[PDB]
Design a protein around this ligand. Sequence first.
Ligand SMILES: [O]C(=O)[C]OC1=[C][C]=C(C2345B678B9%10%11B6%12%13B96%14B%109%15B%1172B932B437B%1285B%1363C%14%1527C2=[C][C]=C(C([O])(C(F)(F)F)C(F)(F)F)[C]=[C]2)[C]=[C]1
Lengths: 10, 238
Amino acid sequence: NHPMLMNLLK
Amino acid sequence: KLSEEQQHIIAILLDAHHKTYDPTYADFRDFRPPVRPLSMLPHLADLVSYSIQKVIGFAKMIPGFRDLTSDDQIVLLKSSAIEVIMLRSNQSFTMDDMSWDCGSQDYKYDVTDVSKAGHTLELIEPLIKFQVGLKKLNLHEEEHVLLMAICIVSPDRPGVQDAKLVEAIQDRLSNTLQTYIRCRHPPPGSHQLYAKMIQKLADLRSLNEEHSKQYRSLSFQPENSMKLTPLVLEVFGN
Ligand SMILES: [O]C(=O)[C]OC1=[C][C]=C(C2345B678B9%10%11B6%12%13B96%14B%109%15B%1172B932B437B%1285B%1363C%14%1527C2=[C][C]=C(C([O])(C(F)(F)F)C(F)(F)F)[C]=[C]2)[C]=[C]1
């Protein structure tokens, strides 16, 4: 759903 | 009145802002170049996408933020992204000519540049009035970074699941801000400063609403959506 937001949040 | 925990929170937020806001604007050379329709859309879309990454870095350092679920962190950042970007850009806004001065003539943005990205006076007029009113507040940097954190962690964002936890994190930040104004901001600048700052958050919610309206009309044209970035499409919508 939001893979780029999740990567930046990790 | 300012406890050591409250002083701890201010120190972290000041450091987080300094690690995510480059006052030299060096990275602006990596963007697609500005051209002065919608000639400014490639450059300003690259600017917003760049700033989204900085807003994410700042949010990760807010005390309590990483106690939320990833679903709650995503919805808070999706909803607040454009508001925090407008708030952060007050650091580059200048009253001398009502523009965002980012180091050079190539990276000075006036109202006509924003309209050359697809936006209308419906947004640009309240936006400029927001920048002027915020400048008139003459915030301490301590208050500027607290407002950024309070804006991100708001329990009434759409899609929030653990609003009780979001509310608890915000309350700890709001009490830090109210106590900071009380003990460190002298009168007459102190007068109703907390209420004036929450009014700016209300101004940002309205600006968020108008931006989303104009974004959807913009991105509905495939030739326009072609000029955006993949992160902008993920955050603001496809
Ligand atoms: O912060 C600093 O001091 C220096 O860095 C920055 C970062 C951002 C700004 C800006 B300021 B005017 B206010 B508007 B323009 B400038 B740019 B954003 B802030 B909003 C902004 C903007 C552009 C493009 C879109 C757009 O809607 C469009 F489609 F491209 F038009 C999308 F990008 F969101 F999609 C939305 C908003 C200024 C300085």
